[model samples]
Target: GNDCLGFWSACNPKNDKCCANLVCSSKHKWCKGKL
Candidate 1:
């Protein structure tokens, strides 16, 4: 139940998730790092 989404990796609202130290952007909604 874990998909490793890298930096700037494409992600979904809930179905997708990001990796460590990464976060889902609000403007793009993709797994991002350091803004």
Candidate 2:
């Protein structure tokens, strides 16, 4: 029910894992984070 917060896949910010504060982009094809 949870997946890595990478790209545009179904992810849960509360349960899923990501690169620190990085989040899934709106397009779900990339991670939303600092450049």
* Leading candidate by lDDT: 1
lDDT for every model?
0.74, 0.54
RMSD of each: 2.5, 5.2
Candidate 2 lDDT score at position 16: 41
Q: Determine which window of 10 residues in candidate 1 has minimal summed lDDT.
A: 12-21
Candidate 2: regions farther than 4 A off = 1-16
* lDDT tens digits by residue: candidate 1, 1-35: 75587888878756557788687776688987754
> How do all models score by TM-score?
0.56, 0.29
Off by over 4 Å in 1: 14-16
For candidate 2, which ten residues in a row score worst on lDDT? 7-16
